Amino acid sequence: QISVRGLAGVENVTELKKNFNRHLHFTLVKDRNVATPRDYYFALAHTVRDHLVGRWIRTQQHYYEKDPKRIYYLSLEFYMGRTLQNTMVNLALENACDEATYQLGLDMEELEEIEEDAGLGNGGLGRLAACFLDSMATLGLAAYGYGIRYEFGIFNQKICGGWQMEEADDWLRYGNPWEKARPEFTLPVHFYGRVEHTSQGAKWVDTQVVLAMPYDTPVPGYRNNVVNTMRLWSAKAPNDLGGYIQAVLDRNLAENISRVLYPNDNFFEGKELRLKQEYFVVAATLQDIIRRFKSSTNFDAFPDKVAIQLNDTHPSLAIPELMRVLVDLERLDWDKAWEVTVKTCAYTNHTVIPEALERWPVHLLETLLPRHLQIIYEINQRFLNRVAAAFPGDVDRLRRMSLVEEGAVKRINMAHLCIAGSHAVNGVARIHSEILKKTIFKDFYELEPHKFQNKTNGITPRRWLVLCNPGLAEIIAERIGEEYISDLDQLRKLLSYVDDEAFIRDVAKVKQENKLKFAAYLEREYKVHINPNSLFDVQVKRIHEYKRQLLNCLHVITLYNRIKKEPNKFVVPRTVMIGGKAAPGYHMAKMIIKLITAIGDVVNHDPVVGDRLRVIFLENYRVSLAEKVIPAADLSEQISTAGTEASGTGNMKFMLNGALTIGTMDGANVEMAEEAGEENFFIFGMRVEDVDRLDQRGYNAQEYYDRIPELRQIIEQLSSGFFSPKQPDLFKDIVNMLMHHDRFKVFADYEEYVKCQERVSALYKNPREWTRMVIRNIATSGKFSSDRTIAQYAREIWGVEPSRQRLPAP
Amino acid sequence: QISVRGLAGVENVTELKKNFNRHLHFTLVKDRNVATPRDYYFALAHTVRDHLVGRWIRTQQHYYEKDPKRIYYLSLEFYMGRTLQNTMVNLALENACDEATYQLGLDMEELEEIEEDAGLGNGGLGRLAACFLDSMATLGLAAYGYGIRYEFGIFNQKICGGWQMEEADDWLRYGNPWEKARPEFTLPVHFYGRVEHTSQGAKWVDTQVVLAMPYDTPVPGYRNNVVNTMRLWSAKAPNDLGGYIQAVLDRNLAENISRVLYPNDNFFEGKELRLKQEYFVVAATLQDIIRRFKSSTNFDAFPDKVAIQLNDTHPSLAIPELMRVLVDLERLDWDKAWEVTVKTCAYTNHTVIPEALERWPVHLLETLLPRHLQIIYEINQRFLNRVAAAFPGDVDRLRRMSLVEEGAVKRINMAHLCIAGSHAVNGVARIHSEILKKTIFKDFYELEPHKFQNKTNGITPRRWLVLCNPGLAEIIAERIGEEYISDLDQLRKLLSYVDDEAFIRDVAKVKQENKLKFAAYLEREYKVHINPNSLFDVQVKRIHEYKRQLLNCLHVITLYNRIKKEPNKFVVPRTVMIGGKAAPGYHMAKMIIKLITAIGDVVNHDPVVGDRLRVIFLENYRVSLAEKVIPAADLSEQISTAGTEASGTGNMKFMLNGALTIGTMDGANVEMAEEAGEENFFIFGMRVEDVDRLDQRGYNAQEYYDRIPELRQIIEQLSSGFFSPKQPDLFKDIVNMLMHHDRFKVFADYEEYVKCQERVSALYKNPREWTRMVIRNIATSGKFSSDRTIAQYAREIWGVEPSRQRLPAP
Ligand SMILES: *Cc1c(COP(=O)(O)O)cnc(C)c1O
């Protein structure tokens, strides 16, 4: 059908149909008479999977022969989403499979909807790991993603009575055709025990053993025949067990380690199970790395053949674990082992929010990992000696930089451990990286300035453009070719089409088709009533106070009140869509979701409003839903308080898909506006400097409430029960927070936000100019490709050169 | 190589090799350079499995079209063993696969040893279910085996310091290529709750729900293209869940139902988890049966289209569950529902031992299955009204026949429930069935004589002859053809070769080769030292006091003492092998194992003994080990106290494989001696009548101890610490039991047993005559084919005719 989807050759299609029927018969053990849509999905998946194996085997054989430096990306989250379409795209099999299934009398799009999302992540941090894997494969790097195979990913969200309800994400129920269990490579992981000091070195004895079983999933590069690996560990109890029956049943105690993903987004919860998960992934991965290193004993070359990237501090135990192995097992002297460790590890920070920082209680590490605690203490001591030497007499700096935090209970600052044991520390957006050097990590930057870098986040244009928005990818390819898909900077060539009447019309047509498509999906599933002609105003991301879904709510209520005030006055029609999950134990986030649905209950049923304003809460927001709503959006809401969103990535997805952005100068928003030009962005609100000034003076919400009549009305409506008749004080906690303890200054940006939104509605009334501004955004989104991000990590941190060379065919 | 293994055609072999390499590549994702023997085993398994799917699909389609009466065999145990070789045998693919792998440079026998036994059973009862499935498929019956997919089967037995150690049987670790998960057919099972009585009927509400997920395994008939199904249920928690994390982790509470097989053989343990397993299998299976019935609403025809066979009382809840469904859900009147239930169910009893009888406490059923308890009470009441009417005034008979047992705690006699709700009740050997009518079920037989039948057990000649003893199957086929493999009575034709010098020599040659083969295996694995020229005296079966492994021990010690008394006197060399597992909580059985190894520690290292006597304990006895040792045996020990072994099946395996039998007139031994002629059997000991006389008088072990010098010496050796130097009183419990509370009268059969063993050694000294007697046994073993057993069940209980017709090809 469309060019960018590859060729559907006679031989190829015939071969596909043949193999589809083979799998349906032999693999699924079914015949055409009893097969269900799910059976058909699996037959297709196995058929596509087959095309991947040959390349997978020779890619790995290739690395074994050329022995390049390996990149190990350690993360406790890999937010993969679905794998079928992405695999077809990267193998240029999409049109062929579409035709093959068409001839078999099946609708491929219907089959793709059956696949379960691999939701092994919470949000930004986990999805970045996913985009990164795609870019590393596309850039020909010998990379391996290492994580945990949770049998339950991020919970599925159900909305009942306007409230969030959580249900287990049993994504493996029907099986996972993409993974390959590798029981032969199982490794032991140790916990508890005690440390024994013998003549020649310390020994960690009397430990509890849990086995780590690896499951490998292929990661295909874009049309370059490279297929890398994502290895996920699963917990298994050893076989060596009222006495008998119970002993067997207790095996699940050990296997609970990989049972479920902790649903906290940017929030630290010091639970023992979480700590076990963190060590489990680190211990198994490091043995795997070392094993592979010794195959093709000086460890001096270790840093030249190995690079370990820590995604946040979750896998920070890799630092002391690597030291433990080198010093305790390999018997290297401390100083030598430390040099190797520092040169091997690099750390990526994802937030400056205090409640998100990992600070593990000493008594927990003491019981669970006694040897690691001793190593951490030794690291801290030698580090502080270095600080004392560089800043003589500065005793306060000593306590500020210590990895050990005194107080009620002693804690280990994992962020400090990561900086001390890494040769590179990076922020994820220019403003974020600057904030790290100027504030929270100022002391460390002063001691070792060379370690601090910036690596602005990015997204993969394969999943976030070609896969989810084929219509847009096609009209773009029509003018500039297909080269941009793996070289996004080429989109700048689109700048010469900003006055092209044909292009303007096509860009607008693609958006309209996406909106109609999504509007239908909302009806087909969930039975809603949105109007395709309205402006699609969307804010999708995890529910968090710093994200400010509440500021958006205030605007919605403002719009509704203005309409009720002057009913027959014209207003640009809008469909406000808000979606995202709230962590199960985050009360305020759960109240915000209820507020949104409550507002919808009033606004969507008011006769005077009509179809001029609709408020919809997008249920169960996840990767596959993002692929649907983002291409249909007109306005992207990125309104976090300045200085709180380290980077953001959703913002980049919206920009690449033709939506204009309304946001604060926070995270990557600053760089996006810089690339597209501020006049092509809807910027508003306090800048980081403004927030600091307010904090110096002291934030008093009452002041805003007293001086802004429209705001006062909203707060009084919430308080009086206008949005909760049967429960008048239902939102008392929300009002109290906004009025007395709002860490994110919602009221402070209210006025500028509302005015900015007016400028948005004004531009939307002029279709031609709205579309021209859209073209200016899409054309300058190239910098946000994760291929650019990965190329920088490769050259500036890992010391390897990316390659676009096709691997010697399949 | 050998005839009975089929043809290895040019096209077939080429096709096999091609598909072997396909699976190694695409299925296992490996190449010739990194593949291990296990990888090769799986490639072969998947290749053979492929040949099974086509027949499997059309067999089931066939039943759907012809709609014959279905046979449902309900059992909590299916002792399957390995599946690879058995599948090749039944598909006539053995020689082809042997050649194909040979050309690929692989040894198929080495690959077969890699497969994990499917040990979902304890012993006799579970293996019978397995043989039965094979025979039902071979006889073309539309049969389905229904059970539980335990993730842990019978524990693997390790011997440490002479003691049994148990370790988890993680048989699914590397995956099971034979099963096919059918998540689409998942069914809900209810537990707990309470009963509500409404206007129109009772309702079971507020229940806890556990899902039953089925896994189907194919069961191929012998060269008839029939492939039946064994459906095993797996427990899964529903998705509808500190609050969050814990809720997810607690899912394993529900999934523990199918976690592990209870390791008790012929012993009842009233644990709640076991009760849940029993209802789980019954509830899921009955919904599946009814669903299938309604597809191709009078339930009057239900008995004409459905037959449910209960293997022991474990699945006895099927009776009240069927009533519950018909009365509560389908709304049939009681009397109508009961008529249907009785005509549908049939019960098979496996033992008369009191401690093995299931008597569930009322308070347990009351809490777990409140509605079923009410139904059982109603059944009991109407049954007793029938008894009161037939035997007016006989109040003691009323309490004796009641399904409800009064006493310390009220219990439900599940055996009584089975008789009341079944149209047929059968014993498993003539003597056993007679004992049921004369003793434990005498009252029931008097009330309904027509219900009681006999169905002597049998074994499948495919696994127990062709598969494990190809050498013997071949020399037999050389004279009488291959027809006997599915018509074992033809072995009688071998009677005309009893004087054939060529045959006598071949039979003896095959046995010698099997012994050398096994002797090697004992060395290769476990490093032992047996002598192939000695008489292989073996007793393999579960360790139990009624089996009398102790009587055997006494003989061994007697032999050892006689040698020490007259060292230079000639004695026929023997290798005594004893094997079997002991239930984890059965103390005496565990002490018996230690005694055996202890005896070996003394006997095997005494210089004076030399290689004239060896005592070896066969570790981890299981189906695959049985296939190895049985063909190598010269003497089969079947020495249970008369009246305690209902039938036995191991005895039949030894008879079919050329071993002579030394045993009591118990179980099927009586029928075996009857078929072969008593002069061709080594019968000894008390008969059932003799045991009763002794009980009338009162058994006093002391009498035997006082009158038999050799026996007194043995007991004094055990007591003094002769077999346990460091621990003199180690076997005090054994001696005390033998002397004061031996329920099985070991001493009473000692003298006759020893004398009989002398007659055995005498015959062994005459190779020619020993072999001629062996031929007389093999030739008359035909009656013990499970094909005969199944044909009788079909005609006399299920009302269906067996068929030997080939199904319309694959
Ligand atoms: C891209 C993405 C995110 C991150 O969005 P932000 O707005 O940067 O927080 C979160 N969830 C999903 C499903 C995503 O695809």
Ligand SMILES: *Cc1c(COP(=O)(O)O)cnc(C)c1O
């Ligand atoms: C045949 C068999 C049994 C039953 O043997 P008996 O001597 O009748 O108790 C037990 N275990 C296994 C592994 C068997 O193959």
